[PDB]
Scaffold this active site. Structure first.
Site, PDB file in Angstrom:
ATOM      1  N   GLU A  66       5.944  -9.750 -13.324  1.00  0.00           N
ATOM      2  CA  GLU A  66       6.068  -9.319 -11.932  1.00  0.00           C
ATOM      3  C   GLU A  66       5.015  -8.300 -11.535  1.00  0.00           C
ATOM      4  O   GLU A  66       4.673  -8.188 -10.359  1.00  0.00           O
ATOM      5  CB  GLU A  66       7.429  -8.741 -11.680  1.00  0.00           C
ATOM      6  CG  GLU A  66       8.590  -9.665 -11.849  1.00  0.00           C
ATOM      7  CD  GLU A  66       8.697 -10.738 -10.947  1.00  0.00           C
ATOM      8  OE1 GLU A  66       7.952 -10.812  -9.933  1.00  0.00           O
ATOM      9  OE2 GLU A  66       9.574 -11.650 -11.147  1.00  0.00           O
ATOM     10  N   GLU A  75       3.794  -4.450  -4.762  1.00  0.00           N
ATOM     11  CA  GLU A  75       3.368  -5.790  -4.414  1.00  0.00           C
ATOM     12  C   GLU A  75       2.004  -5.682  -3.761  1.00  0.00           C
ATOM     13  O   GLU A  75       1.801  -4.891  -2.838  1.00  0.00           O
ATOM     14  CB  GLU A  75       4.365  -6.360  -3.433  1.00  0.00           C
ATOM     15  CG  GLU A  75       4.023  -7.706  -2.883  1.00  0.00           C
ATOM     16  CD  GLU A  75       5.116  -8.320  -2.052  1.00  0.00           C
ATOM     17  OE1 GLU A  75       6.258  -7.835  -2.029  1.00  0.00           O
ATOM     18  OE2 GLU A  75       4.838  -9.357  -1.334  1.00  0.00           O
TER      19      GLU A  75
END
Length: 205
Positions: A66, A75
């Protein structure tokens, strides 16, 4: 506690050091991880030694995937703020963003809200703390693993690593994304070898 399975040197060998373009253990620190891990009864401690090592490897393998190998805290280049305005239990705060943060890339107003309730931070007005406080950051991941998903039950109940993929992002399973499944599996195999444990079966989903 988890510190009997994961030493400082093994942790650093899983997460990596800070480098160009890569937070590594500059943010994802060993004692923040241990502090987080030991706050959730059963995490890495529920089963046999081998089961507990597989759980730890599975957690880190998904987190490595991730975060780009623990390179990223947030992100990258999000196109959304991840505000589900239909959720009235956990309403979005204007000006805040709920894109992925931390080891398991916690996302959405509703998840930040729920995580913050459990962990004791304001997930709606202060989601950015998941990217600045490493203990909170790791707690969000262990919360997701233990409380907000089937990851812990899967890996501790004979379901295999692939069932943890399914618990985190089931769209990748069933042919959905062979490449991301391969990436997660590759990290899991690496980390099982570093923890001296058999991977088990059912690695894909």
């Amino acid at each position: 506690g988890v510190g009997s399975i994961v030493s400082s040197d093994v942790f650093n060998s899983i997460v990596g050091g800070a480098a160009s373009g890569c937070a590594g253990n500059g943010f994802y620190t060993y004692d923040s991880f241990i502090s987080a891990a030991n706050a959730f009864n059963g995490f890495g401690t529920s089963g046999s030694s081998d089961v507990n090592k597989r759980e730890i490897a599975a957690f880190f393998a998904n987190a490595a995937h991730e975060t780009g190998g623990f390179c990223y805290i947030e992100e990258q280049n999000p196109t959304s703020i991840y505000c589900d305005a239909s959720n009235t239990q956990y309403p979005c705060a204007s000006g805040k963003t709920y894109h992925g943060r931390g080891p398991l890339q916690l996302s959405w107003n509703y998840n930040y809200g729920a995580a913050g309730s459990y962990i004791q931070f304001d997930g709606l007005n202060n989601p950015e703390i998941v990217g600045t406080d490493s203990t909170i950051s790791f707690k969000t991941a262990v919360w997701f693993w233990m409380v907000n998903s089937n990851c812990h039950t899967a890996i501790t109940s004979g379901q295999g690593f692939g069932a943890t993929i399914r618990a985190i992002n089931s769209m990748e399973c069933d042919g959905g994304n062979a490449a991301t499944v391969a990436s997660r599996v590759n990290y899991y195999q690496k980390f099982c070898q570093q923890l001296n444990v058999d991977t088990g079966s059912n690695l894909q989903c």
